Design an enzyme around this catalytic site. Structure first.
Site, PDB file in Angstrom:
ATOM      1  CG  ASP D  25      -1.972  -1.113   1.197  1.00 20.60           C
ATOM      2  OD1 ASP D  25      -1.643  -2.215   0.691  1.00 20.60           O
ATOM      3  OD2 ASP D  25      -3.108  -0.915   1.697  1.00 20.60           O
ATOM      4  CE  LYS D  82      -7.125  -0.557   0.067  1.00 23.15           C
ATOM      5  NZ  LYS D  82      -7.206  -0.750   1.539  1.00 23.15           N
ATOM      6  N   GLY D 154      -4.611  -1.829   9.762  1.00 20.94           N
ATOM      7  CA  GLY D 154      -3.906  -0.695  10.397  1.00 20.94           C
ATOM      8  C   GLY D 154      -3.464  -0.841  11.850  1.00 20.94           C
ATOM      9  NE  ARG D 166      -4.294 -21.479  13.424  1.00 21.66           N
ATOM     10  CZ  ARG D 166      -3.487 -22.496  13.118  1.00 21.66           C
ATOM     11  NH1 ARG D 166      -3.923 -23.510  12.382  1.00 21.66           N
ATOM     12  NH2 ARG D 166      -2.223 -22.495  13.534  1.00 21.66           N
ATOM     13  N   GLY D 215      -2.779  -6.247   9.314  1.00 20.81           N
ATOM     14  CA  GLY D 215      -2.036  -6.460  10.572  1.00 20.81           C
ATOM     15  C   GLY D 215      -0.626  -7.047  10.456  1.00 20.81           C
ATOM     16  N   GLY D 236       0.634  -2.912   4.388  1.00 25.80           N
ATOM     17  CA  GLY D 236       0.503  -1.457   4.336  1.00 25.80           C
ATOM     18  C   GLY D 236       1.285  -0.754   5.426  1.00 25.80           C
ATOM     19  CB  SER D 237       0.204   0.634   8.671  1.00 30.03           C
ATOM     20  OG  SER D 237      -0.927  -0.207   8.552  1.00 30.03           O
TER      21      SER D 237
END
Lengths: 282, 217, 282, 282, 217, 217
Positions: D25, D82, D154, D166, D215, D236-237
């Site tokens: 991202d 997006k 995020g 899972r 995450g 991303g972050s």
């Protein structure tokens, strides 16, 4: 006496003999004879009660040994008896009587609301009831050599039996899928021993002989259970409360021995008479 | 391609079946036998252990269709047959003896072994034992002091023909010496023990070889 | 690699070395040195955060291996590190780094909310946390070589640690009392494996080394845990948030080594300085 | 234009190219370059906001096409954008701009609370988010060519991502176990189309490319997702909020390409710097 | 009555203690030693395995009271002492060598074995091995090719006196041949392995006999 | 035994792998190649489709260890290599041309095909097409008017040697006539399309035969 040497490998060995068989519930010698005649690999001896007593809620206990001895000497097929859950003294008594197998049964009045019999302490193999895999495995953990579904005893309604069969079947094929890491939390969810879960995984099935029981009323019912992967069948009221016990008994045996052959299933269902009336009151 | 069948209308087979698969012989196919069609595909047949007053009843359907086919298979076609526990009883000339259990009994046996046999004479089911045996054969299978699974087994009381070869015996400290464990008569093999309940596959191998030879005939 | 040959008997063997010891949580080399100086049998390496970051709720992960390598080469006592619950890849990474022991810790942010790490797959021994016997045995079942109480991490309050110690202590002595029949239902209640329950029964204690952890703030606290039958102690904030970390660190070690000698406990508690402020907000 | 001729077989074909890849991202050209440099198979373009604006709750929309065009001409790797859920006109606009893939994203503000975009009506392939198998299959039913987990966008916390992975993994292997009769009721339970359930059954996996997202903050996180059977990773972050975006970006790519090699995972984790602070506020 | 003490301020003793109890010797009492009072009841002492930068620290209390009592025990009273893993390190002249871990280090060792030793030079804790050994003694205990529990053990690099007798060696396929496993010097016995982790009790017996002989003096 | 490897550090392989398995050739083993050890087991190598500015980067680890091994494999050992989409670019002499993406770029290509090639010149990813092709070979594989999966593909702008054989071309109604789809130069095969995305296995079979011949050499 007790197992978990290889008298076990011995008990298991003995139970394998029962695969493909029908065990029948009998109240008297006449019923035993009918059962033997029909091709039953064994009979399970029940207390002989009249219908008037049936209304009441009397405590259901293991049968008088003399009544077992009386029936056993008039037949040559296998002889099984019932004991109350957690009643290890009833078991000790029937062990000494040299019965072929014991059923620690929920159909009799519980003797101990927390503990089942420690079944390793006996040379006689036990069968126990279950409605799901955890329950099944906890019984095997305790020493059961054979398992049956609980179904719905005496109702002539197959529906519960089917559910219990499918529940165990799924959990087993699923367990077989999971990764080595995931098996632990699943063991905790089933509240069952990891060892037996891993063994079920390695065998790709239940680690002991597995019979359907409760509510079987027609040949069709019987075959259905077999087509769903069961090793055999217990039948009681579906035979002896039908219009023609002898014919019904024989046809159920034939169906279990030929459960994949529609043409035989049809043939042994013709002119069968009325099946047990039954009860649809959950 | 060798096809051996295991009568499956009831008794303990998926073992017997498993125990033949343990041989790991490329040429060998095992099938379940539950009807005359299945039986027709077989080069040899095993009639396993289980109830007999059960196994026989299973063969009685459609006016003894399977029974008759089995009798023909054993006595006319002379195809190899291995009657173990219950199956051993159902190959026997004399069966000892059907006090009440008699129904169409005379036709009860398939025949094939000229012996007199005694429905499990050993107490009940919580006494069944185990064994080590002796063998009067040159076959490669049979090796060192083997083991058995004599479980609530039948007793061979009489040998009735010189044609009957006593294949294996054993000595027990509660049943006497020279108890007959295995017999062979032409295209018939009979054992009173449970071959599927011990790890070794000696008798499975022996019967396989019998079936193999039968063909090359 | 993996255990359950007798590298286990090996892991257990290695953990026994720790009995009587104090493991200390360190954020930098200076802290490690203080810990070594004080008699610590090992240090456990933590992420180095400032107080301002502490407010936020940042995801707490395993430490950068380089920071572990940097601290380890300035000391000669044992070196331990933390991984997130169920984070088997963080474990794989630290395994390769040749760390002495891993702590699958609930103080870090969970990586997998259902499954713990399958710890048999590692040659490095694991320590895990518990608040009760079932939980403890499930961790051992999964392959833990050592157990600690959870206590209440970082609060400087001993109360939870004490509860957890007593809970496990009782269940263990009780389990040891029950008859052979009763053990099965109890296993199901603890949701733990019957095998390890029987082994706890035969050993008369927890089958692995068992340390107190969380909230230990004075020598007195430490000794108390030892007098309750623990094999040792983890300490963190109680030392390095005290007024005199070096003196506190040393006194805690002395107390653990002399936990039954009131005269030494007194002596090492004199003029200790202020203990960690702490927090009584459950 | 639209699919379900074999331009589909075409879209699927195109998405397969992404297997083993990391999509990143990016907010500006500098970030795009860093991503290209690190080995990213693609970048996903985000709105460029300052931290002060972040406090507010502004409506998050698809990005200005000009900003996409600007970034795309300074790189040669894949370019994704997006759109808001159910906002088919935003999609029509970006389709005309010849973007490589669209993400109908739950991270942007929903445009339609009941209906998703009918994605068959486009030649550009879509990726969509899921937390379970039914949801995944409904998105594919609607025309998605690729699926990702939702995770927790995020936060820098991997836990939700793992759960979602899972959940889907199990339902899939389980579905694969059931008998032909049972599949119907199960379809109704997942509220998913029987056709795609049968196809998942026959393929033994998800019928489209399947990436982990949300995450991921360390190489370890990334590899873990891959070891659980994912086809790739969105990040991303975790990169651009880390101490050293360039080094973190490169190590994440290496890890994804070598997710089964602990020695490389170790090696690329050394001296990485601080990972994104993150947030553990569910 | 023989009393052997096991230093218990930390390390693995209830094994060492257990392992002496396995000897089943009627005369033999085993006690924990944590203070000078305990030490005064001992005919011999074992200094077990565990951390050393820990065991030494434990001795450091009340201004080195126990440390000093132990040095007097070993060097003045000449009572038999057995330093295993960490204990072995604490009996050594030269300890290799305390880069940071140095605090009061020169007094660190109790002394007793004139050797130079290397703090666990073997990797970490997930490499520790096991061994079989060789023995240069006539003592009845030492029998057939014994075993050891060399776990993250120290290394004896130098023998610094003729007084030091090399009691047991071993050959490994990764550390060289003739690795020194056991040394003895007067009233001091030193081993680098873990005697308490294997089932046999040879070294326990040997040390018992030493303590027994020490009294009869 | 013929082992063909598929470079797997990223790109679309479990297809390529699947597509070679579709050949159903008993002698053929397929492996993933992610390191020099894997590469050493290979008789031939496929470098699949995916990013290149990615595939190259993956080979750049440990100071270009894998890169160097691949260069040696292609140019010294002369083992058969099949560079498809991205792999075709990485076999090319000239790559067109790295405006910003340049990093160690001159070493960027493995080399092997003396051609000039243009990173996907076709619009974006929502224009990628399909094809039917022509073939200048006698090999049994290549049959009737085959199909391709030209997806955001690269463009072969120049042939730079007479050694380069133009194996396959096609004519499009938007890119001109005689577009070069497949080239071969010694031990190198290069394709601009996606062979794994159509059901037929012609190019897999052809490359297999190349690898097979390479051995019999």
């Amino acid at each position: 006496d007790y197992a978990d040497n290889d008298s076990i490998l011995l008990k298991h060995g003995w139970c394998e003999m029962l695969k493909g068989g029908v065990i029948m519930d009998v109240k008297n010698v006449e019923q035993a004879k009918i059962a033997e005649k029909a091709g039953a690999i064994g009979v399970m001896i029940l207390e002989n009660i009249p219908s008037e007593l049936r209304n009441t809620d009397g405590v259901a206990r293991s049968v008088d040994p003399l009544k077992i001895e009386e029936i056993r000497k008039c037949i040559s097929i296998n002889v099984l008896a019932k004991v109350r859950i957690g009643h290890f003294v009833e078991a000790q008594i029937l062990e000494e009587l040299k019965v072929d197998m014991l059923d620690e049964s929920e159909v009799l009045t519980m003797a101990d609301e927390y503990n089942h019999i420690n079944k390793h302490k006996f040379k006689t193999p036990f069968v126990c009831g279950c409605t799901n895999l955890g329950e099944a495995l906890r019984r095997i953990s305790e020493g059961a050599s054979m398992i049956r579904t609980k179904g719905e005893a005496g109702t002539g309604n197959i529906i519960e039996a089917i559910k219990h069969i499918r529940t165990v079947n799924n959990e087993i094929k699923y367990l077989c899928s999971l990764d080595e890491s995931e098996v632990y939390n699943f063991a905790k969810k089933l509240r069952a021993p990891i060892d037996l879960i891993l063994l079920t995984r390695k065998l790709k099935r239940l680690p002991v002989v597995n019979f359907a029981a409760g509510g079987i009323a027609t040949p069709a019912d019987a075959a259905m259970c077999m087509q769903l992967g069961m090793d055999g069948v217990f039948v009681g009221s579906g035979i002896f409360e039908s219009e023609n016990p002898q014919k019904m008994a024989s046809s159920i045996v034939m169906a279990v021995s030929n459960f994949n052959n529609p043409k035989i299933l049809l043939n042994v269902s013709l002119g069968l008479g009325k099946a047990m009336h039954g009860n649809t009151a959950a | 391609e060798i096809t051996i069948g295991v009568l499956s209308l009831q008794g303990d087979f998926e073992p017997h079946i498993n125990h033949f698969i343990k041989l790991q012989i490329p040429s060998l196919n095992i099938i379940q036998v539950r009807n005359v069609h299945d039986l027709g595909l077989c080069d040899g047949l095993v009639i396993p252990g289980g109830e007999s007053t059960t196994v026989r009843r299973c063969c009685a359907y459609e006016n003894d269709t399977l029974y008759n086919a089995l009798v023909h298979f054993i006595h006319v076609l002379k195809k190899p047959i291995w009657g173990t526990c219950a199956g051993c009883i159902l190959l026997s000339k004399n069966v000892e003896n059907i006090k009440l259990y008699s129904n169409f009994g005379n036709k009860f046996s398939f025949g094939g072994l000229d012996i007199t046999i005694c429905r499990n004479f050993y107490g009940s089911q919580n006494d069944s034992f185990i064994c080590s045996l002796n063998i009067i054969s040159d076959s490669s299978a049979f090796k060192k002091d083997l083991t058995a699974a004599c479980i609530r087994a039948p007793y061979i009381r009489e040998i009735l023909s010189d044609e009957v070869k006593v294949l294996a015996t054993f000595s027990h400290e509660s049943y006497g010496p020279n108890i007959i464990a295995a017999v062979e008569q032409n295209n018939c093999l009979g054992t009173v023990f449970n071959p599927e309940l011990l790890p070794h596959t000696a008798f499975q191998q022996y019967f396989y070889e019998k079936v193999k030879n039968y063909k090359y005939s």
